[PDB]
C-alpha cells in the first residue's frame, strides 16, 4: 500500500516484486533466509515510502545477518547493493553499451577525453565483449561498500553514482595499455581486465578511483631526503606540501640535520636543533588537513647515533613539554650491526652530530667496514663533539617508546644495503616510506624544482595468493602486473622534477601479495610453528622469479631503465646471492626456477624496472577481493567496520571449511614463527616488508611485556635479515 518512485509519483506496493529480487540475489547462497530478510524490512515500511528506501532497508536487513555461521548474507547483501547501484547509475539493471557509456561520461567530463581518441568505437564494441557484468555478483557486501565509497566514479555533492565495477576495470585496462601497438593492445586489455575483475591482481585506491578520469595524480607515497641546509629544509618542506595536497603518504629522512648547539658559520651563531625543523615538516605534512588533524601522514627517519637521539625518541611521549614534542608523525630509528653488538656486549654507543663526523653517515648505509673504522676513529678523537650512552639504556628507551606508541619503527640499514637491488656506493637506500615497505634511492633537493634531486615514489600492486591455483599462474599475472604499472609510470604526472627523475631513472615498482593468511590456511600451515617456512620460501621464489622474468622480458621489448647500471642486477647479482645466510638454517626448500638462465638474461638485456616486489599492508584492496590483508594473520573470523549505512561485517574467506585451519593473530604464542616467515620472504623481495611485532599482555607475569622479550624479538628479526619493523600491536581487551 502506497510507495513513492523517483519522479515522486505514487504507485501501490506489489510485494512479490521485492521477493523476486531477494529470490534472485539468494541464487546459489547457502544458509540465508529470504523470509528473515523480508520479516526484518517489511516492518519498517510505510505509506509513500520512497522506493530507494525500500532498497536500502532490505540491503541492511541482509547486511545485519552477516555472521560466521551464515557468511553468504555477505553476498546476498552485496547483490542487493549491486542491483540498487545499477538502477542508481543506469536507471535499469542492465549496464549500457561500453561505447555509449564512455561517450556519455566523456560529455559529462567524468572520463578522460583521450579514451575516445585512443580507441575506436569498434574497439570499444570489442572491449564490451570482454566485459562480464555478472562478475559484480562475486563481490562481498563489505567490498561493494568499498567500491561505492571510494572507487566508483561519482558526484560527491549530489551523491550520483555514474558507473559500475566492470566498467571501472575495463577502462583501467584500456587506459593503462592505450599506447600498445594495435596488434596486441586489446589482447592485453582483455587479459588485464580478467586478471583484475577475477581478483587475481589488486591495484591501489588512487589507481582504481582515477585511471579513466581526467586526473593524472596517482602516487600514494613519496620519499624525500633532506640535506642539512636551510635551502634543503625549505625544499623538503615545499615538496611535502605539494605531495600531501594530492593525498600522498610522506616518508622523510631528516637524519643529516645537524644537532642542537652545533656551530653555524664558524662561531657567529649556534644551531637551534632538529626539533624546530621536525615541527616545521609536521605542519607541512598536515597543511591540507581539517584543522591540523584529518589525514596527512608521515614517518621521519634518523640514525640511532644522532646526537639528539634521546630527545628524538620521545617525540610522541604525551607526558612532556609542548616545545619538546612532535607527536603527530611516526619515527623510524635506523640501526646497523655495530649498534646491536654494542647492546649485546653491554657496551656504550657514542652519539654524534652528522655534521661533525666526515664520512660516517654515508658509511653507515653503504659500507659497514668503513662505518666501523670511522666510528671507532671518531670515538677516540677528542676534538669531535660527542656523547656516550649505555646501549641497553638507548635500546630500552627506543623499545619503550615503540611499545607505548606502537609507532617507533626500526630500519636495519645494513640489511637494506647489503641485500638490495642497488649499488650502495652509487645509490644506497637510506630510508623507507610511511608504512616501512619501500626501499629506494633518494637525493636531497636544494630547491623544489632542483633537477639533481631525487624523490622515491610507491608504484604498487599485488597478487592475490587466494585466487591462483598454482604458482605458475604468476608468470602471466607478473607479465600483466609489471606491464600495467610500467605503463602507469609514463601515464601519470609528476608535480616535482625530482620525483619524475627517479621514476623515469629507475622505473621502480613494488608488487606484493594480499591473502597470505588464507593461502596458508588452504595449505594447512600456520604462522607460529614454522610449518609454513618451506611453503613460504617456495611461494616467494615463484613471485620474485616471475616478476624479474616479466621485467626482463619487457626490457627486451622496450629497453631497460635509464639508470639500470646502478643496480646490482646489472652486475649479475641476484636476490638469491645476497640474502641473510641464517635463513639457510630455518628452511630447506630448493629453488625450483632457473635462476642462472635468468641471471644471464638480466645481465644481457637488463631490467625495465630496478625493483619489483614490496610487501605492503592493505585494508581496502583486501576488502574488495574478500581477502586477508597483505601477509598478516586475521585478528578474528569476522571483521567489523563502522559506516553511516550501518555496521559492516566481513567473514574470512571460506570460514565454513577453514575456521580451524586459520591461526588468528592472538593465537600465535609469540613472534618467532612470523619473523621467520618475514625473513624468508625477504630473501626474494627487492624492497622491504611491513613486518609487525605483536604482544599480548595476558601471556606475561603481571601482564607486563618484558623488555628482555622485546629486545630478544628485535634481535631475532635482525638475525634473519628483517629489513624494517613497523607497528607493534599490544593487545588490550
Amino acid at each position: 500500500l502506497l510507495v513513492t518512485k523517483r519522479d515522486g509519483s505514487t504507485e501501490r506496493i506489489n510485494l512479490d516484486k521485492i521477493h523476486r529480487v531477494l529470490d534472485w540475489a539468494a541464487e546459489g547462497l547457502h544458509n540465508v533466509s529470504i523470509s528473515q530478510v523480508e520479516l526484518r524490512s517489511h516492518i519498517q515500511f510505510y505509506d509513500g515510502i520512497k522506493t530507494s528506501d525500500i532498497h536500502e532497508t532490505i540491503i541492511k536487513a541482509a547486511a545485519d545477518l552477516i555472521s560466521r555461521d551464515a557468511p553468504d548474507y555477505q553476498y546476498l547483501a552485496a547483490r542487493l547493493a549491486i542491483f540498487h547501484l545499477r538502477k542508481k547509475a543506469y536507471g535499469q539493471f542492465e549496464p549500457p553499451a561500453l561505447y555509449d557509456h564512455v561517450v556519455k561520461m566523456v560529455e559529462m567530463g567524468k572520463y578522460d577525453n583521450h579514451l575516445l581518441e585512443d580507441y575506436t568505437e569498434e574497439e570499444f564494441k570489442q572491449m564490451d565483449t570482454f566485459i562480464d557484468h555478472d562478475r559484480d555478483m562475486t563481490f562481498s557486501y563489505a567490498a561493494v561498500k568499498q567500491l561505492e565509497g571510494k572507487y566508483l566514479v561519482q558526484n560527491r555533492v549530489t551523491g550520483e553514482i555514474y558507473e559500475s565495477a566492470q566498467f571501472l576495470y575495463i577502462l583501467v585496462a584500456a587506459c593503462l595499455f592505450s599506447n600498445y601497438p594495435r596488434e596486441t593492445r586489446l589482447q592485453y586489455v582483455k587479459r588485464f581486465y580478467d586478471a583484475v575483475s577475477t581478483f587475481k591482481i589488486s591495484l591501489p585506491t588512487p589507481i582504481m578511483s582515477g585511471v579513466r578520469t581526467p586526473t593524472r595524480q596517482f602516487s600514494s607515497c613519496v620519499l624525500i631526503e633532506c640535506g642539512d641546509s636551510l635551502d634543503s629544509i625549505n625544499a623538503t618542506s615545499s615538496a611535502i606540501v605539494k605531495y600531501v595536497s594530492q593525498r600522498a603518504g610522506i616518508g622523510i629522512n631528516a637524519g643529516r640535520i645537524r644537532a642542537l648547539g652545533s656551530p653555524i658559520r664558524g662561531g657567529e651563531a649556534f644551531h637551534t636543533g632538529c626539533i624546530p625543523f621536525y615541527k616545521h615538516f609536521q605542519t607541512a605534512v598536515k597543511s591540507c588537513s581539517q584543522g591540523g588533524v584529518r589525514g596527512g601522514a608521515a614517518t621521519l627517519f634518523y640514525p640511532m647515533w644522532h646526537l639528539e637521539v634521546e630527545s628524538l625518541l620521545v617525540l610522541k611521549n604525551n607526558r612532556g613539554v609542548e616545545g619538546n614534542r612532535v607527536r603527530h608523525m611516526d619515527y623510524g630509528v635506523q640501526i646497523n650491526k655495530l649498534m646491536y653488538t654494542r647492546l649485546l656486549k653491554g657496551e656504550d654507543i657514542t652519539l654524534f652530530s652528522p655534521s661533525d663526523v666526515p664520512g660516517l653517515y654515508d658509511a653507515f648505509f653503504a659500507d659497514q667496514e668503513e662505518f666501523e673504522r670511522l666510528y671507532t676513529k671518531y670515538e677516540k678523537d677528542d676534538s669531535i663533539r660527542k656523547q656516550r650512552v649505555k646501549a641497553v639504556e638507548l635500546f630500552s628507551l627506543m623499545m619503550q617508546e615503540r611499545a607505548s606508541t606502537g609507532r617507533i619503527y626500526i630500519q636495519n640499514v645494513d640489511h637494506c644495503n647489503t641485500h638490495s637491488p642497488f649499488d650502495p656506493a652509487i645509490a644506497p637506500v637510506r630510508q623507507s616510506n610511511l608504512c616501512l615497505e619501500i626501499a629506494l634511492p633518494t637525493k636531497p633537493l636544494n630547491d623544489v624544482n632542483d633537477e639533481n634531486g631525487e624523490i622515491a615514489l610507491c608504484t604498487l600492486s599485488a597478487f592475490n595468493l587466494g585466487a591462483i591455483n598454482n604458482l605458475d599462474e604468476l608468470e602471466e599475472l607478473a607479465i600483466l602486473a609489471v606491464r600495467a604499472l610500467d605503463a602507469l609510470l609514463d601515464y601519470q604526472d609528476y608535480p616535482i622534477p625530482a620525483a619524475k627523475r627517479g621514476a623515469m631513472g629507475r622505473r621502480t615498482l613494488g608488487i606484493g601479495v594480499i591473502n597470505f593468511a588464507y593461502y596458508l590456511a588452504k595449505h594447512g600451515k600456520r604462522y607460529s610453528d614454522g610449518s609454513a617456512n618451506n611453503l613460504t620460501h617456495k611461494t616467494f621464489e615463484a613471485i620474485q622469479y616471475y616478476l624479474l622474468k616479466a621485467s626482463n622480458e619487457l626490457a627486451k621489448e622496450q629497453g631497460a631503465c635509464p639508470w639500470f647500471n646502478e643496480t646490482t642486477y646489472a652486475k649479475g647479482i641476484l636476490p638469491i646471492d645476497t640474502y641473510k645466510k641464517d635463513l639457510d638454517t630455518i628452511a630447506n626448500e630448493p629453488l625450483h626456477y632457473d635462476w642462472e638462465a635468468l641471471r644471464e638474461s638480466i645481465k644481457t638485456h637488463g631490467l625495465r624496472n630496478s625493483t619489483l616486489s614490496a610487501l605492503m599492508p592493505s585494508e581496502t584492496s583486501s576488502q574488495i577481493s574478500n581477502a586477508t590483508n597483505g601477509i598478516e594473520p586475521p585478528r578474528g573470523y569476522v571483521s567489523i567496520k563502522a559506516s553511516k549505512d550501518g555496521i559492516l561485517r566481513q567473514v574470512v574467506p571460506d570460514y565454513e571449511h577453514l575456521h580451524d585451519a586459520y591461526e588468528l593473530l592472538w593465537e600465535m604464542p609469540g613472534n618467532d614463527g612470523y619473523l621467520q616467515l618475514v625473513g624468508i620472504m625477504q630473501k626474494f623481495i627487492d624492497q622491504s616488508i611491513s613486518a609487525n611485532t605483536n604482544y599480548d599482555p595476558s601471556r606475561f607475569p603481571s601482564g607486563k611485556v618484558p623488555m628482555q622479550q622485546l629486545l630478544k624479538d628485535l634481535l631475532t628479526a635482525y638475525k634473519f635479515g628483517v629489513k624494517t619493523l613497523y607497528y607493534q600491536n599490544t593487545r588490550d581487551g
Partner: peptide, 13 residues
C-alpha cells in the same frame, strides 16, 4: 624494564 645482558651476550647476529 629489567634487562639481562648475559642472556643476550651469546646471541649470534
Amino acid at each position: 624494564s629489567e634487562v639481562d645482558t648475559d642472556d643476550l651476550s651469546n646471541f649470534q647476529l
